[PDB]
Amino acid sequence: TQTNPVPVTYPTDAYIPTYLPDDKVSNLADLKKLIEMDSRLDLYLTRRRLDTSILRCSITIQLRGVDGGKVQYSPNLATLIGMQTGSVNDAVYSIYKYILINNLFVTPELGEVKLDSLLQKVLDTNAAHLPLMNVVQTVNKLVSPLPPIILDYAEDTAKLREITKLALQLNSSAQKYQFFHELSLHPRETLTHYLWSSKQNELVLQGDQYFNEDAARTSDIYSNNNNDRSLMGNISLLYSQGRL
Amino acid sequence: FQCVATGDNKWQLYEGNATFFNELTHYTLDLMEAISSYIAPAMKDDHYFQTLVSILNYTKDRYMVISILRSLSRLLVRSKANEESAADNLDHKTLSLIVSFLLLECDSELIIASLDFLYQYILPGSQRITELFKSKECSLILEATLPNLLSYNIATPDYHLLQKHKFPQELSDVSKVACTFLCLLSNDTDDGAGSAFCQRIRPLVLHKLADIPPLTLALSEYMENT
Amino acid sequence: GDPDTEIRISARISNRINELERLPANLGTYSLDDCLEFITKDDLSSRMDTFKIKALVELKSLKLLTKQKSIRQKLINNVASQAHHNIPYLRDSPFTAAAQRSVQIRSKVIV
Amino acid sequence: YNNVTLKNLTAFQLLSQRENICELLNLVESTERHNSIINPERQRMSLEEMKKMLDALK
């Protein structure tokens, strides 16, 4: 995956209302218990999913089983490890644990090690300090592959989408409840709010009707519409700014 | 906003004013995120800390959760070692949530914020490490995530290619923070609950040091403390 | 739009241009009000050109059409291009004020 | 249709605000939006599913 979450088009777990009276519903607590039950169970599953991985001619035949599960060791590195032909990651871990046993870092101070006899023999170098990066880079060179035979002579997304859609319908029904409840308590200063805001939103929707194709190619904007006053009064300003 | 986030019957929010209120509460937290460094002595029965720790359980905004975590991180800075709000006001539903954010492998700002909160929470060490490693689920997610967060977004040497033929030289941004937190957690001496964790993580981190050589300079005080 | 019925307009204007451009240049009037001026053999009456000016206002106004179109574009795309700082009932709505307020948010300083 | 405009928000709020005032005067029916979401046969079918889950879980 990425380093940041993926934006997506459809909603994802919108809220549950809390202002409904519990003397009538008495059920949102139970759905709440089910939701934190799901979150706890999902926490357990995600932790376990993370922790589950935590002339005479010769015969040359390249076999079926040329396989890097058991890779050949150089005999110097075989003497340093001890095993005959084990693996590559086992080799890296064994070399690093040998270095960690012999206390060679420092008693870059932890990058530089103290080169001893066998390790200089298996690396064919003669320094005293050499960083661990190059030491484990040489492991890639010191290992050779195994020799062949030689003879000479989902539905859950849609389900969660449905639960999200249903919770949105719950939000819609709760908002339509709360409107009529607040109108039921004090009706004066919500009907005045309606008569104000409906008028203002009608003016906002009717703020765009003189910008059509054939309403601007004609002449019934510029001439005789001092009733409108909005444009053709900017021309004292727009020429003075050089736009034209 | 705490009265909204808890659901108390006093001052139930009218929904039609909600867009008037919503951007009202994003501009206040950004003040509380900025001035909290100057409220650096945290008291016991504080109202800011109680209110934000009530808010953090409710919201679903990534931005607002990161702002609450940074505010609670920078509010407990020059704290104490004996008695402030962190010893009691974290009511264990919240602290089980902040450590849970380490499981989210995809995001990376939230992991850094959660590790910084736990790091600023764990600097005293006496009554803090036991409280952190007290729970059967808070002390157990850290056994799985924190060795895995060392090689987070780092090109480890793979072996699937070597099984199917037929080194990074760097770190990440959260690997440094995890190494810092684990070296600070290795300083819990006298064999309390901290080194009991720091001994049970070494056989798994030892495989991570064999892959990434910049984990040798880092994880130094932990390796000296084993 | 609809460029079927756009060419059927732009082919009636070429009719009027190539009908006005075949009038004779020596076109002149004779109103019924020159009798009150007593024009002699050579006197140059002062209402002789009330049709030739009118037959050039049309012929040059029907050639300056795609100049007033280009001025009307610069007018409308600088009056309607603001639309939320001059019109009062639009810059007082909730959502426009919230959008203009929210575009001005300066980015958060980490530490 | 993926994005919203000022016209879309204003039209949505005006539509949802005029649908609420027309239920006091009862000049609109709105029985279809009621009964397609209540659906009492779907309600008793869901309650039978809950009852069968009680039987299978006991």
Next chain:
Amino acid sequence: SLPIEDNYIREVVGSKLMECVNDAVQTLLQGDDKLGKVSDKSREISEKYIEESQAIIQELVKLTMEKLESKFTKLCDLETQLEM
């Protein structure tokens, strides 16, 4: 402000409900005697949505459980596998 091609445009190319509702509401905001006649008339309509809302809520309590059931049948997998 010159009509130049307006004649060729005219050659080739040749509500009340909510205003009455607004007048009705402006008459409802005059005398107090109708306001109670609004209020209880509104108060039943709120109840009409409460009988709506639980019919949504008792659906979610159904639709969660199968998904929870879809997480038990996976977790009883691990009851074997870890013990393996």
Next chain:
Amino acid sequence: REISEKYIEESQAIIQELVKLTMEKLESKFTKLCDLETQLEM
């Protein structure tokens, strides 16, 4: 209303029974696995 009242009044007992039963079964199954994992880790 009456069909709605019939299937909305009886249903709440079914709901508050079934969620508590799922609480019981899930708490039992988690107390099984949390003791299984310790004998794993030893």
Next chain:
Amino acid sequence: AVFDLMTSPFTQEEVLIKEIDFLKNKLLDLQSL
């Protein structure tokens, strides 16, 4: 691109120093993202 005149306790050079200090930071923020 609209300029302005105003009073300040700083000289015109010091204002330009502050403009450099602000625009370097905004340049790094926007080129980094």
Next chain:
Amino acid sequence: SNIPDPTLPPTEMMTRFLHPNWYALPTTVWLKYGNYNSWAPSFNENGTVVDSTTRGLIWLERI
């Protein structure tokens, strides 16, 4: 002069108009973490005009 004839094909006058009643307004950004992440902060609202609830309702009554 350098004006064109009025019998040329650009006679459009409204092609790329885009009144600022028709602009896109900034709203909430729903995020997706993974398949089994059901406790995470699900969305993000930095500088939005409307909430998550009203934007979910606007999504609901179109689809």
Next chain:
Amino acid sequence: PLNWVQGPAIFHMLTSPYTQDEIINHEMNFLKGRLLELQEIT
């Protein structure tokens, strides 16, 4: 103490959108075309 100083160049763009992704290119062009004009003064 007064100092009559010329103010900073504020990027007031002609068309004003609301989403950020329609702004960032113009603001990058403004930052370049301001800091290059200002760099020679030093």
